């Protein structure tokens, strides 16, 4: 009912190409996460 | 990375194993050529003499 209008749209692309450039990314979600993931990915190394 | 080399040992051993009988199979079979060839010159020799 809209598609007259919908492909025309507001927020579409200006995140992503200065996107490669940057280092700081998803990173809090990370933080506390990596310091669980890097323990867990030593363990299942070293059985295998 | 350290999966993919795992199982596949296991199966190329399975593949050894095909071969392995059959191995055992021309041993079997070497040792009755052999043997085949000793009487047959165990009665060449007998018959020398």
Same mark, same amino acid.
């Given at each position: 009912?809209?598609?007259? /209008? ?12 200065? /996107? ?7 990173? %809090?979600? %990370?933080?506390?996460?990596? /310091? %669980? ?8 190394? %070293? /059985?295998? | 990375?350290?999966?993919? @080399? @795992? ?16 191995? #055992?199979?021309?041993? #079997?079979?070497? #040792? ?7 009487? @047959?010159?165990?009665?060449? !020799?007998?018959?020398? !003499?």
């Amino acid at each position: 009912a809209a598609y007259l /209008k919908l492909r025309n749209w507001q927020w579409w692309r200006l995140f992503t190409k200065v /996107k490669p450039l940057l280092q700081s990314a998803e990173r %809090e979600k %990370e933080m506390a996460s990596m /310091k %669980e993931e890097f323990t867990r990915l030593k363990e299942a190394l %070293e /059985k295998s | 990375k350290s999966e993919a @080399r @795992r199982k596949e040992l296991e199966e190329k051993m399975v593949s050894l194993l095909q071969e392995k009988n059959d191995l #055992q199979l021309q041993v #079997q079979a070497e #040792q009755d050529n052999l043997a085949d060839a000793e009487e @047959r010159c165990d009665q060449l !020799i007998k018959n020398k !003499i």
